[PDB]
């Protein structure tokens, strides 16, 4: 227990069912075709249906929710964005030209020798980068008035076809000369050399020396596409392109220059960026001098030790529900089956290992079976047991668990076992609800995303995937009325704030709201 447990106005039991969504279509809907009388009552009258997919939880529009994103958003009380989502939103709404770090890189150039470098993987593979981000950056840097911009094109062939690079090179060349009339291609080199992540500095050195010294084949805008096509016929593909050099010494990285790397994945950026921006050029052991007074910038942060500013730096995830309750000196309980323990732990608590002060944990072991359709109740009963024991104790004014059956059985695709899963989950919830009533907890049932509600493809085939359907949010306490946000659908990010409002605890500013209940 914790010193301010008595300040709590209403103790709360939160259940996160895993893979339990709301769908009107009953064909292959294991929740609808399962005896679920407990949830059928809890999901009626005062109850809400909230989003767990797509942008509502920091994912690309249209993408199904999943267990990690779900538990992250639930426990965080804010939307937890993917980096790629953050970047693409910024492209949609012209927020590059106001980006503080990008404005910083550009101002430094403008008040120095004004030379800027763009370097990254040029393709639409979308794993490490996107060429549209590169395009969007050139336009931005143009608007901001940087005098000179040179581009260092890293060839892909791994997240795209090995002979796709000519197309992106053509498309880059036309963009710079006809669309922006600004920016110049200075280098082409394969990601094999520039985006090594196994500390093979002899590979990095190839891209290093090309950028700073022009160690490659000379070409120009008129010839460069032919060079690459000749390389293809020599059996050298995008990934493995040896360097090509386009603007002479003007396009090299020189003294006092600024560099922006536009990849948003870090592992394959740490080496080239540390070679340019710290002391790792020494590992390349080049006979070339290292330029003086460089400053590097990254689309994202590649290593917190690095001094590099970032266009989209990491969110700290400060004052997620678990940390915040401990700050208020209120104690808590987290419980789950094996298969979902990282969800009520690592991910609920912000995506780290921290178990905060006053946080008590319980791991109920999952059954040892080959597939979970062979025991579709899994260990939900045991999880309920431990939760009911905490309700009898009354020690923790906030307790929570996860029930795995609906998701983990849904993934098998066996429709009738899914039905059993949801039946066994519903019985478990019913046991806790009885206990909350007897020991005066308010019960709240939600889910992290759907799954069980769609078990069949239109044609009857197995459908094992997660869904984009909304999920329930129930509240047994009759002095509150559910109310939607005025500006958006409610979403997982509103579970934690709503919890704190029922508990009479303040909300921390990092929790970008919002309680979706109001008192009667
Ligand atoms: Cl080589
Ligand atoms: Mn799953
Ligand atoms: Zn899940």
Author numbering: 20 to 539
Provide passages from the article that reported this PDB entry:
Phosphoglycerate mutases (PGMs) catalyse the interconversion of 2- and 3-phosphoglycerate (2-PG; 3-PG) in the glycolytic and gluconeogenic pathways. The enzymes have no amino-acid sequence similarity and differ in their mechanism of catalysis. iPGM is comprised of ∼510 amino acids and facilitates the intramolecular transfer of the phosphoryl group on the monophosphoglycerates through a phosphoserine intermediate and is the sole PGM in nematode. The iPGMs are monomeric bi-domain enzymes where a phosphatase domain, structurally related to the alkaline phosphatase family of binuclear metalloenzymes, is connected by two hinge peptides to a phosphotransferase domain8. The glycolytic phosphoglycerate mutase, iPGM is an attractive target for the development of broad spectrum antiparasitic and antibacterial agents owing to its essential metabolic function and evolutionary divergence from the human enzyme.
Although soaking of pre-formed iPGM crystals with Ce-2 caused the crystals to shatter, we succeeded in obtaining two apo crystal forms, monoclinic P (iPGM-m) and orthorhombic P (iPGM-o) lattices of native C. elegans iPGM. These crystals provided the structure of a nematode iPGM. As anticipated from primary amino-acid sequence homology among iPGM orthologues, C. elegans iPGM is quite similar to other iPGMs of bacterial origin. Similar to other iPGMs, Mn2+ occupies one of the two phosphatase domain metal ion binding sites while, as in alkaline phosphatase, a Zn2+ ion was found in the second binding site of C. elegans iPGM. The identity of these transition metal ions was verified from phased anomalous difference maps calculated from data collected at wavelengths of 1.0000 and 1.9016 Å. These metal ions contact the histidine and aspartate triads as shown in Supplementary Fig. 12 at coordination distances listed in Supplementary Table 6, and the catalytic Ser86 nucleophile coordinates to the Zn2+ ion. From the apo iPGM structure we observed that the N-terminal 18 amino acids, unique to C. elegans iPGM, were disordered.
